[model samples]
Target: SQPVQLKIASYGLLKNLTWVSLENQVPGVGEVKVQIQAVPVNFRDILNALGMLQEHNQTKLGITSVDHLTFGFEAVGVIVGVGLGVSQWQIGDEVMVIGCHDAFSSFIICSPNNLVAKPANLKLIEAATIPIPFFTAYHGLYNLAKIQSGERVLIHAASGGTGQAAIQLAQFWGAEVFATTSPQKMAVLREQGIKHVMNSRTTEFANEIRELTQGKGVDVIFNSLTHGEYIQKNLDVLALEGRYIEISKRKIWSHSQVAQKRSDIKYFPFDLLEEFNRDNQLYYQIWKKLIQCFENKELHPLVYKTFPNEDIVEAFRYLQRSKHIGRVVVTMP
Candidate 1:
């Protein structure tokens, strides 16, 4: 059978998203084939689609100079086939994939190690939203930041998926949550019970955070905003020895530059793809933690806008507009 796939002929515009047929391949030993149900449109996906990513980063994501660039990192689906030596999973097992490529397709063949059983409580669409966004938050907050209960946590661009995940996780860990998002997006954070919401469009949130914290500053800053002056403002709002977790891909300060700014504060600039390549076991471990929290009701999926596969371009357009409060999802029949 010809498996349907959405791929980019070249990386330049949303119009490059094209429908193509892939030859179906059965799973090899130690592999599993998933009938993908849903995938999330991440900011990186938009960058890849628009050809905004640097060549090295694109190569790191397995983009070839010649072949079509397949640009998705997560998927949730049902396992339809299991190859020899695959003992941990079987046919009919519902799962979510993390740190994988080409997820915007009807099926995927990958090792079982990258698959996590979908939380029983979340649907495929919701499960699809969890992998990258939540994993970024989980790794940055729990691993890099090692945040403590009762400490203050600041989340920039708090209305997006990773920001929302950080807000939830910080609160779940008993930290006080402060968030910044566009004024148009403030309502969602406020509705989520975040009392210290500020405007993400401007750097003035630094002063607001200082005032809100009585000049003490937050203990951890989860920042995804560009490294314009916003980067320094983040350092200013971090308390003594606070942690700064940067998930943005551009304009990052060098380690020595940040050390020059603050001797005590820790700066962690990370890319999920790079980290996954560095240590995949830790990647899956964090996913397991997220799964436990999701099952225990400590974490919940963010709201999303979905499009049928036929309306995929519209999905990318809506995401590019940056108006969606949560994930932009694409579903397959």
Candidate 2:
């Protein structure tokens, strides 16, 4: 019998969890089957479950699934089977995969190209936290912004998975890092050795950021907040020739709008999944770049808590509360 899968029967703020046995076919050429060990629950999964993703809904967005959508973004596991023409990986090899939707299951069949070897120093649960957050961080800071040494980068929501991941990457590139989170998470960012940590809830961060930077402002911003005056405040804090990488989908300001205010600032509203769906090869290329960081010991997974697979609902609930730091993961029994 195949192992069970976790899913939401329908969309609502209060999710109705459902379980069903997974049905799988043997891997075919260009494919590999993995015995999934751990899957990280992203904020996207919570928003999808609560019917709050808006125009970013599964059907409207990339990798569409109309009524039934399985939850999960990234998974880490051991390859149990490989098909013909698949020579890069072996049966016992451990790997991580992104650009997947059915990752909540015990087993998943996927293209061999999507797999990246898990770092030897990390456990499956820790490795599961690597893909989404780290890739998002790399794509935004390194790939898009082209962050350089001695520059200052501001990261909002600095206690979350991607925020912490961005911090490490920015610091690795020798960029001075400024971070923002809620009042309660101030210590979390400080513990990461960041001297400039501000509260994320208020628009006053613009002035504070300016003051902290000696009125020169930040060179780049990794932003996710979309409420209130956060958008304008982000623009206010940018230095000349700065790059602003926005990760939010709703109420996104257009390039024209940005140019009207500060044409010198380059604006990028990035959706990693959308980019992955359009051209999967880019995902592989990013994986290759990220591997170098892991091998150099410059990156590590940030996990807040891990729950048994049976407590999937509880895990989602914990994420919804938004109190935890870093990523929350669910592990198979």
Candidate 3:
């Protein structure tokens, strides 16, 4: 028997994406077949679609040589069936899957190791948004930064998907959190327990950090926006022995300070899944902890908007505008 499948394929900036159909056979040998319920449009998804993310092809699984690759990284679905040796999960299990290259599809068949059981109370759309940003934040803080209680953590773009996740995770991990965002979102950020919301439009965050910390600087800085010039500013606001983790590859750091030059300014490119041998074990532990937090309702998925699958163009346009505060989801038909 064959299962119907639908996917989003990227052409370019002009064409954006196209929907295509396929037939998927049932899983075999350690495989699991899933019917996708929802997927989140994350910033990395946008960057990867545009071919702008660093190490784009290196760490990604699947879509190796497709001319027009499918978009999406994380999704939530119900397992229709499992293959031989797949005893960890069975049919009818609601699972959250990650690391797939093309998740903007109606169904997926992959190894059981790629899927995890989601919280029972969470909706599929909400669960879809959790894996990427939540995992990124978890790895950055607990694994890379080793965030400590009472330490100060500054997150750039605090109202964004990854930024907001970082803020909440840092706060939950006992770090005093600070965030930079546009003036309009300050109220919402404050309502979400963010004590210090810097209005980047009117204020300088580096200066604010200096004043807030009484010249001590923040213990950790989570920089996701890849403008690059912010590296110097982050260094300025960094406390002694502080760590700087960034996801973007924008040329923010001076050429002189790239690795060999500045030992104090540590740059983490934010590929927790690929940093095996260096920090993969710690990354996995942090991820497991964050999943528990999500299951327990201690951390919530931040969704700014939802669009029907047919309206994906509008969703992509909205995502390009960089105005949304959190994850933008597109529900599958």
Candidate 4:
């Protein structure tokens, strides 16, 4: 009997992601065949679809395809087959796959190294949201900033997925966290354990930070806003030796001023993983350990909304509105 096959679909300028059928063949070297259980929608996915995030048309860190490409970066699934010489996982094992450019499909075939064991206590759908935001926060805070206990860390977009994760993780590490959001989200951000919630709409965040910190300044700033105006202000608010991690684009002036100030500030781009060397194996290892934090309940997944797969367009629109307080998900049957 022929095996059932599924087609992963994509739309828009990512129109290349139309429908691609799954193969029924056996797995090859170091590869595994997976039946996807859940894939979460992310803001980056929406940005990539809109062609704003991908410089040089390179999406997902340069993993590009011409045909309608399957576009999801992370998901949880059950393995059905393993390739030759593979022994770390077996069929039926639930796993979380990471760093994929195309993960929106119903099935996936990839190297086993890309997959991590799912935490036993967490649901697959919940685990699906971890890889991107969590890793992004993890690398930025622990790896780049080396955020120490009692230090002040300012997280922009504190109500979103990465922002919330940064808040929880920084708090867990004993750092004082200050987050920025709209006025309506201020109450909610406080409820999420953020003590210093700045209303970016009415007040100047840099001035707020100055007053709040008593002019000493923050130790680290995790910023993802595209506008560059905040760059110099972030530098001013940085304590000597403080680091500024930029996860989005901004005006050229911001870059120039940062260079001119010659401040003891360091800028970390989100694409740091692309520069990892053999010496950086510890980076991947750190991420692996961080995932266990989710399973242990020390880290929680903040879901703003869960949309049915059929309503992807609506989900995309919702994300574009920039009002969601946490992760917006798209659930599959």
**How should the candidates be ordered by lDDT, best one leading?**
1, 2, 3, 4
lDDT of each: 0.84, 0.84, 0.73, 0.71
Give the range of the ten consecutive residues with the poorest summed lDDT in model 4.
1-10
- Return the top candidate by TM-score: 1
Across 1-333, the per-residue lDDT of candidate 1 in tens digits comes to 247887877767788788788778899998999998888888888877777665756556555552556767888889999999889797899988887778888988988878888888887787888888888898999889998999999998888888988888888899999988889888877988998889988899988887887889999999888756999889988999999999887678888999998999989999887887787686668876777888888899888888888888888888888775878989888
How many collisions between residues are there in candidate 1?
Answer: 0
Query: Model 3: per-residue lDDT, tens digit, 286-319?
Result: 5567677887889987765788877877787787
Compose the digit string of candidate 2's lDDT tens values, residues 54-139. Answer: 45665565535524677787898999999999987999999898878788888888997678887777766777888888889989
User: Against the hidden reference, what TM-scores do the models get?
Assistant: 0.94, 0.92, 0.85, 0.85
Q: On a 0 to 100 scale, what is the lDDT of residue 145 in model 1?
A: 94
Model 2, which residues run further than 4 Å from truth? 58-66
Clashing pairs in 2: none
RMSD to the native, candidate 3? 3.4
User: Which residues of candidate 1, in runs, are more than 4 Å off?
Assistant: 64-66
Can you write out model 4's per-residue Cα lDDT over 191-270, one digit (the tens) per residue? 87778888654338889889888999999989876464666667778887788888764233354567678456776765
- Give the total clashing residue pairs for model 4: 7
Q: What lDDT is obtained when candidate 2 is compared to the true structure?
A: 0.84
Segments in model 3 whose C-alpha atoms lie over 4 Å from true places: 1-11, 53-55, 58-68, 199-203, 249-261, 276-287
Clashing residue pairs in all predictions, respectively, total 0, 0, 1, 7
Error of 2 at 78 (Å): 1.6
Among the numbered candidates, top lDDT falls to 1
Give the TM-score comparing model 4 with the true structure, all chains together.
Answer: 0.85
lDDT, residue 65, candidate 4: 37
